[PDB]
Write a protein that binds this ligand. Structure first.
Ligand SMILES: [Zn+2]
Ligand SMILES: [Zn+2]
Lengths: 49, 47, 66, 147
């Protein structure tokens, strides 16, 4: 279980990071000055797991 | 309908007319309730 | 769950001999001597008492509400 | 000399100290203790195409298993029986501390809720792994369940 959850969390965490840069390249460079708490969208790791 | 707030096998009984925001025990706030057995007499064959 | 009323093989009543037998065996007596004193002579009726598991004691803590 | 009873005493001690699902519990406890931090340390830090905007990741921690009642505010702790009865998932929230850096200026660290992690029963993150038999019966659990 630990070995497989390591891979699962590694895959599910880089998709969460990839979503953060997408909302920092476009959402705050053009349009507003945003905070980190708003752009996380925490329900990405949860649904994948 | 007559219900029963389930914290164990038996707790205080509540009925349907008690309207709340959702399903919950009025006395303790627990979120699981159970239907009671109606007092109709049941015939069971003893085989 | 609870002790059967009758032996499965023959129709002898065994449920009323469970409490004396179990009380005396956990008191340190020999099971064979207790069974012979109680009048349980056929091995069909002795397996009824020697293999019963009292599960209702555990189940009364998780009874369905209904 | 070791007779039958001594060797059986050794084996019985093995079974008492370590249960029958130790291969699961050891693996999951090792995961919780090391691999969560290892994954984000091997991630290192988040850098974007903006010249001077990056986030450096900190530590991770998890809470006790809890749920949020349709945004009722605070999270309330639940037991495995309630999760079974209400079709919930027995999981705990995980928080990641991040530092937003704007052109080599570190700024104030912030702790971010990043998701929910399902909890294996009888593991180190399970609050029911330490309860006595009577307290396990009180919350509606089978005392002999191995998890
Ligand atoms: Zn109640
Ligand atoms: Zn018989």
């Amino acid at each position: 279980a630990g070995d497989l959850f390591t891979s699962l969390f590694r895959v599910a965490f880089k998709a969460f990071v990839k979503d953060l840069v997408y909302q920092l390249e476009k959402s705050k460079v053009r349009g507003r000055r945003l905070s980190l708490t708003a752009l996380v969208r925490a329900d990405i790791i949860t649904e994948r797991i | 309908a007559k219900y029963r707030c389930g914290k164990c096998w038996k707790e205080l009984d509540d009925d349907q007319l008690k309207t709340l925001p959702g399903v919950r025990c009025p006395y303790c706030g627990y979120r699981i309730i159970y239907m009671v057995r109606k007092p109709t007499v049941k015939i069971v064959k003893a085989i | 769950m609870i002790i059967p009323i009758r032996c499965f093989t023959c129709g002898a009543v065994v449920a009323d001999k469970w409490e004396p037998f179990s009380n005396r065996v956990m008191g340190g007596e020999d099971p064979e001597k207790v069974l012979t004193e109680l009048g349980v002579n056929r091995y069909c009726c002795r397996r009824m008492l020697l293999s019963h598991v009292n599960i209702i004691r555990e189940i009364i803590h998780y009874t369905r509400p209904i | 000399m070791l007779d039958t009873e001594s060797r059986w005493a050794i084996a019985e001690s093995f079974f008492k100290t370590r249960g029958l699902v130790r291969q699961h519990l050891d693996s999951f406890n090792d995961f919780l203790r090391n691999k969560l931090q290892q994954v984000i340390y091997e991630q290192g830090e988040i850098v974007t195409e903006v010249p001077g905007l990056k986030i450096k990741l900190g530590k991770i921690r998890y809470e006790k298993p809890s749920i949020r009642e349709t945004d009722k505010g605070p999270m309330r702790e639940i037991t495995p029986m309630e999760a079974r009865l209400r079709n919930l998932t027995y999981s705990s929230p995980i928080f990641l501390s991040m530092i937003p850096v704007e052109n080599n200026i570190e700024g104030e660290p912030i702790e971010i809720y990043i998701g929910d992690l399902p909890i294996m029963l009888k593991s180190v993150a399970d609050p029911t792994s330490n309860l006595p038999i009577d307290k396990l019966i009180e919350i509606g659990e089978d005392p002999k369940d191995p998890g």
